[PDB]
Amino acid sequence: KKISGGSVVEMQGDEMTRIIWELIKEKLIFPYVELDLHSYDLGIENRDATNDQVTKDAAEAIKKHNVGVKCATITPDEKRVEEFKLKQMWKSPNGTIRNILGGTVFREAIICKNIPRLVSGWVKPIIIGHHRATDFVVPGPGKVEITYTPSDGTQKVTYLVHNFEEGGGVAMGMYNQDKSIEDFAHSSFQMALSKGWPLYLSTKNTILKKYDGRFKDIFQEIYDKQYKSQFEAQKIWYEHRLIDDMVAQAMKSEGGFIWACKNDSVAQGYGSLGMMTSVLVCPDGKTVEAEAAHGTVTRHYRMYQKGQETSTNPIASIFAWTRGLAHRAKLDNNKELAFFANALEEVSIETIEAGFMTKDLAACIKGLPNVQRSDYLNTFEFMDKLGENLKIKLAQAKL
Template identity: 45%
Template sequence: METLQMKTPLVEMDGDEMTRVLWRIIRDELICPYVDLKTEYYDLGLPHRDETGDQVTLDAANATRRLGVAVKCATITANRHRQEEYGLKEIWPSPNGTIRAVLDGTAFRAPILLPFLRPAVPGWEKPITVARHAYGDMYKAVELVTNEPGVATLEFTGESGRTQSLTVAKTKGPAVFQGQHNTEGSIRAFVRSCFQYALDTKQDLWFSAKDTISKEYDGEFRRVFDEEFANTYKVKFDALGLQYFYTLIDDAVSRVMRSKGGFVWALKNYDGDVMSDMIAAAFGSLAMMTSVLMAPDGSVEFEASHGTVTRHFYRYRAGEKPSTNATATIFAWTGALRRRGELDGLPDLVSFAGKLEAACLETMRDGILTGDLAVLVEPEHCRQIVNYEESLEAIATRLAKKMHDADRR
């Protein structure tokens, strides 16, 4: 069987811990036997980020803008504990936050569904897609800890020389402060991408924030959503029978729980981070959630929406073979390969991505499940609980048959 050819490389961002282990197996055993894989490789593992002063993360983000398509493994976001564990020179920022700041895109996250995997919310009949603004808020915030009484102020000096100033707080003792920001341009790009995604997928669009409390910051998001809808998207939504509405985020949570699903839920950066994990867990597993970052210039980055599966990695390092679900990481690869094939006019590469996804889903439908799914299904739907190696071997077997059958035709 001849390997499928690629024209343009993908940006490949390697990661950390258990997902790094899965990454190599997926690449070498599920993709490379069938695709002459071309990638521009960047090691975003925490040790290498530390070695390069995090320059590798910026390089990977800029490469994504240049090549247009990237696939990313899950990475560690460092804290003081991780600094001690890895002996880091600094507590480096979230690589996802850095990449999103460079690309200024929107992260769309949607669950991967199985017919026998019932959501924890019984009324959900269709997937819920979280559209997460991927710039600013606490991910670009500055923070300050003080140890004496004093006054904190927020000051802005415009290019005109005009200064605006607000008193944040007068403190009587030690305190902690955080300054967040966003830009009108980034908010508007987020809003437009949400409306366009809803139109493309023919789904209603909800946006929620807390403008009753954050009257200026959250209010700016609501203002731009309302303005873009009225001026550009209302006629298009009406033509398709779609609805857009805003509601406070606490009201939105209760509405989501009572809904049947089947809509796009647009959220600010941190809100989207939290709620996408809630949606993933309620639909089944964090390992069953896709994530694609779409930038205004058309570049896209595919990744799993979960973390590095640290507890499984510690067990792996101790010689065990944990039951880690690789589905979302596989779908990150297939999403990137499909997009690359579409952009470069390579239908066979697009078809391969579909076959790999089908092999993955068929393995689970055949009752071969990792532990995270096995505890969620009725006994008749679980024939075998497997570790990560056994799961990937079962997927490889089904993929080989699909590729062989296609080659014979």
């Protein structure tokens, strides 16, 4: 019999990632793992047909069952509205899910030794996690003020942002709740423990002494109170850094740390965004949603619609599953599932490291103008190779 993987929430998506998603389930997951699968179709046509109710249900299912794996979906714009004759310009599914669940998005690369990187010294992953606008034009002279009116009726506070004495300009207001900062802290500490690396927070608290100082203070208070003992047990630490110092140190590091950032296209140089997953980590320590860091790869899908050959990287999508299942295994103390998830990840890394890869990675190594057809495998060929290697890997582990 297969591995009993338990309860997993699955979200089907759009275009090229939809094709790859089904191949991942068919060739890599279903042949080895049985799931109590809570499956939701977040394809654009179904979201339209259900008036986006399917997206809300999916979010609630993740809250209920703790483990979510999601395929990339189309975020509608005016162009998509015309393409699919949509009823409305539906909100980003990711945005709707994030609002219901809360949490912090962490991005982790899939490390392959033969794939060029920004700093050659980076041998371990650098897992980065990021935390309303209210801006307006100032047409002419006048005061911009920002006020705080306590809910308890005590005297309101008025700060002068700027008195425009001559000419116009622009002004802006921003905020951050302590609760959100607390969630951000908890998620970051939990992430550092689960992966087994040190955590760093970066802020500009020298300039924004009160705004960014709150982030520094809250992280320290929660660290010293709730996480310091557990960190020291694994030979791990937490320290605050200034953003300028943090980047300079990271560029001369070996990697292998969590970077909580207070504020994507840089990371695409590492092969592509096909080598980056995006995991939402909720502050409860229980709930996770995993997906690829890239979109639906529309350009590749158009070629697929015409019957032309495609070479789309399934790694990020594959690692959405493995990091989803790894969390599932951790929650249920499921040693068999834990091993399988690891095995699939290693198989994927090994296959690329042995010279079998999709065009994006071949282009990163050799340069796009220099890439020939013999340097890479198409989408189907690469999936077949992974499946063959997966079978061989699992047979070896049975000894």
